[PDB]
Symmetry: D2
Subunit: 326 residues, 4 copies
Amino acid sequence: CTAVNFQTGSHHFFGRNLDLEISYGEQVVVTPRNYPFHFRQVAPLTHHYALIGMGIVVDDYPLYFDATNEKGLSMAGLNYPDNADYKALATDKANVTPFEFIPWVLGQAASIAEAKQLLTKLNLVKINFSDDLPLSPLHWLIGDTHSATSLVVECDKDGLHVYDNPVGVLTNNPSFDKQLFNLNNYRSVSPRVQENSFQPATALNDYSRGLGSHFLPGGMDSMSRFVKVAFTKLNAPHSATPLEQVTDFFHILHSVEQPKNLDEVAPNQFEYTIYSSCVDADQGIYYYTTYTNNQINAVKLHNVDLDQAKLTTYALADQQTVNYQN
Amino acid sequence: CTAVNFQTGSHHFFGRNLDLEISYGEQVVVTPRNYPFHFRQVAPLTHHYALIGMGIVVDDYPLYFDATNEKGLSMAGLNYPDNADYKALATDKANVTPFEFIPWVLGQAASIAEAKQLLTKLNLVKINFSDDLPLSPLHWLIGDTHSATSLVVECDKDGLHVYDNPVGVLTNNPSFDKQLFNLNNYRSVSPRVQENSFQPATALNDYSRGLGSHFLPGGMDSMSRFVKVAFTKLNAPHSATPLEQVTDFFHILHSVEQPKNLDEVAPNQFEYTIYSSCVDADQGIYYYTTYTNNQINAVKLHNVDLDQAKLTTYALADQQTVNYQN
Amino acid sequence: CTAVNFQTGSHHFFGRNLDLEISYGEQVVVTPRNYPFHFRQVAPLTHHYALIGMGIVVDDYPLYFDATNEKGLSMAGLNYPDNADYKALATDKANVTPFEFIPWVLGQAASIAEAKQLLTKLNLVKINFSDDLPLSPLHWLIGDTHSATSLVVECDKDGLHVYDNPVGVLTNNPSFDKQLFNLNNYRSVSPRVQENSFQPATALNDYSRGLGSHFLPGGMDSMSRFVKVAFTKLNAPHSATPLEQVTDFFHILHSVEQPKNLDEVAPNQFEYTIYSSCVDADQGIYYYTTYTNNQINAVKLHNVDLDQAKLTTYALADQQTVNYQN
Amino acid sequence: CTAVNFQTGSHHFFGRNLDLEISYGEQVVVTPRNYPFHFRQVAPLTHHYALIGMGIVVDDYPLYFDATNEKGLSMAGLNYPDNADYKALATDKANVTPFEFIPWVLGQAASIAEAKQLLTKLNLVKINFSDDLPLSPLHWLIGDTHSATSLVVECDKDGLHVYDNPVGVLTNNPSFDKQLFNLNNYRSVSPRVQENSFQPATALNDYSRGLGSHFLPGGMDSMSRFVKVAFTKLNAPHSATPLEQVTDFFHILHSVEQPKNLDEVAPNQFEYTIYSSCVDADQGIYYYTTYTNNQINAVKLHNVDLDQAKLTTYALADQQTVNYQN
Ligand SMILES: [Ca+2]
Ligand SMILES: [Ca+2]
Ligand SMILES: [Ca+2]
Ligand SMILES: [Ca+2]
């Protein structure tokens, strides 16, 4: 998985690749303001901000992979195997399950600054959604429309960690302190061909455009994708119009998509990028591609009656949709 | 630039990324059988195989970047700076300019076997199209629908070279013997997590899916893209229908697209993937995406009257085309 | 700097490269049992285990870079810039300066088990030896002759950390959790040529012996040296005699020596391996080479009267000493 | 194998690592001026320049791995598997066997310029020394005391190649055009920490000295050792005295020695650096270390009666020779 919080030209785009070996029946899910969220161990949110994101609906409950609220606050949950350590109930904390975490934050917080207030009280508790659907190990990226900031939330064996993330990207393991530190090793990677420091008197031929990034990683693994997406995001252009910025964002995410069949997780099982999302967080527009359809599709939050109480779901436009010009 | 010859399930797909710092006004150009091909130093081709490909029409003439003929033979010209060496007129040989080379081969030859016969009589002559447009340094990939074989044509200072290319990919510099040899260094890269050979008694954590490709290159440079596209192409799935295979092909080419602004070629100039093409060579369908529009577009060769004599051109659908689902 | 704890055939060898840009006048220093160790903030050690190691005698006091006591316990202090955080005096704890730390542990403890007991009461206090010589930022490797265990001691801003280190090597930054984790990325490196997993159907030439370690790091930086020295140490042979094992040990340390002038730390200043040491910890024999003399030199702890109270120092044999055979 | 031609301060040092899985009984062999060389297919050299180098003596004939003559011309033969292609007899060439090549050149040539005259006539012929001792596939590095030049001689399937080699190093496969070209990919490696070009606004910590060489190869394979030894040689210091320059040379060669047991060539067989040589080519002094003895040993050409006709051989000082200081 890869998530990116991208800010250009006063605009804010947030989204992710979902990389998995099997699809769970993903849909774009709009949760209106009056859908009642009845949490296991904290106070209910029966009126709250509307949400749009990708998820599945089980027992009429929206299980979000990622979402953005009507105020521009976004979250994505990304696989964090072995490191995630959910906790026992704590009598002096807000006890929230990992499947409730996105609705709990996004339903009531409008900014990263406000989300930080919730995070100071949070205890992520080890309660399964159902006996059929045990908890996935996750960590989260959070972005908003009010700062250049991103947060990374990692609940580890030693406790809850909340990191500032100015780079604005996240993948899978290792924990964020190790992941971010690794960028230090790539300081010499460049968009330009560097000076010959190997030995200036030795005739080294600048034989290919792009030689500046010769040591950039391109593997399917979490650390390689973190480095590559950081370089790609940090060197993105600053386009003039919102749709061009969306196009730029998709080029960032697709730079670290996992194609079939390059990441084998089990015999006859390959992890690949099921979908790539980009939310225009200012407008509430959820754009996405899928592995099977290259055309960008969009669902507009504000085309739904946000005062309803029922979920609205859209099946993904999953079939390759070609424009036949003659 | 990157070009790929991809065969799966009786079907043949051939296509390329065009990576440049500026667009030249590219269009899909269909040259029908009776468009007369005039050459600077050989007899004209007044009746020939029809061609479909991407190019520029300059005055009255189609200057192709890549093309496929009605018999399934494909060619793409890719940047080959400094290594390309075009020749003086040779008395005993067919003297063809690099800009006439695609029409000359594809107009006459129906297969790799026939193309090889033409290449034994070929001299690529240093003659500019005009004073305006001097010759570009190129090398070529050739594929067909009769073999799992690709050819690489490189006209170097020491003469013309024609290589067998079973891997079926090509980028830019260096020459193909050095480029193909470099794959030997990546033998240990894997779709699956390899056994711990560093020291089996040491507890090394398999902490990320995709760790098998941890050492795969991801840079924008020619050698990095060659390695990555080879690994991605050689590990592609075998899908059931031609449209799904086209989708797989685009995931191969997009694995090594060059995003803005990661490859700086000069101050304020960045080489990026202008378009990516995929030709179904058995049906003559030219599919493409562009940097600015993610939807796949298609032009069908056989929707044109191939007995005409005039060119048929299609402007690229280059505006981002979103499917709004609500 | 690099330190290694190496065990083979019932024997224990411990030693280090000292990498600095300038030499400080290092000598082999034997501190006998009755040299009184005076400390700034704890009781003196008037009778203690004897020590042998490399250091500087400043006024009357031995400042050790590394040492081994008469019971087989060894310690080395290695540069740990920016991460080291020495502490204010703590009322409940043994307040020991970083320059007293080696005498404090090795003077009292005979094994890792006993050293661990001392570490539970330790506070490394920020007290300079003098205004002339301010404290250096360090972390420590500890080994013994009773286990195949090494300890890493790192006093960071968030407190004192003591890690188990089965691999038995240490360099400089980053902290040991990040450093040890990095070995996971090198699981596929091998002493032998690996199977072709890039694509088995593609003819990849096994063109060089040693291709199994094609991705092993060779740079002068701390993380590169950690990976290379780990691979080299973990794949060392098991030789029959102690002197042959010493030879094997020096090949391990020299695998990551820093030659002039490959590591520039400032204009006209290059960090290089001043000396490499190997202590036979069971016999108390301190072997070393220097950058300027390739012959191994040795000082035997037990050739000194260990009941004395005065220091015994040996100047390094640092002039290149050639055996002329004719 | 690795060979280096090193020039500093008006002095010339030439030498090599011999990397093999088994020792052949190597000795330092001095061939005096009147030892008769009776060649298979060219005129005899019964009076010629004296030679010193490492070799074996079989049937009273010196089979040199490497050698230097009394005029300062040096050659080393290094393993070149599969690529070496020795030829049939040629009636218009000087037909010289690969085992005669070093005596044939060094016996009669005093400079690279003179050796070039011999190379224009050379045909390396496929004649075994004996049925017991078939030819090894080799390529050669040549240096002298009159230029900064080195030559590389490679007899390939397509013919004899003689390359200029200003870098002055050589290992094993691939052929020299591919080997030297590979240095282009390492232009950004540096003795100093490079500017942060990954993204200047992103806080990348310069956390380790030596980070400039983070991407330098350290593997046991031929291409890795070529890059590492080139960087190490090209960044060597310029020491003031001959013996210091010899010490510097050994640090260059030892930077790419192959330790046991990191290069497995067959079950229970590991290729390792049997010896490392350094010839002061101006003085005729053959210095060497061995895997088993770290002390430098030396044989002086001019301590032998060079007007004799019998070979003089010295067994290597192979046992670890320690200087016990107390
Ligand atoms: Ca609120
Ligand atoms: Ca941690
Ligand atoms: Ca002569
Ligand atoms: Ca060749």
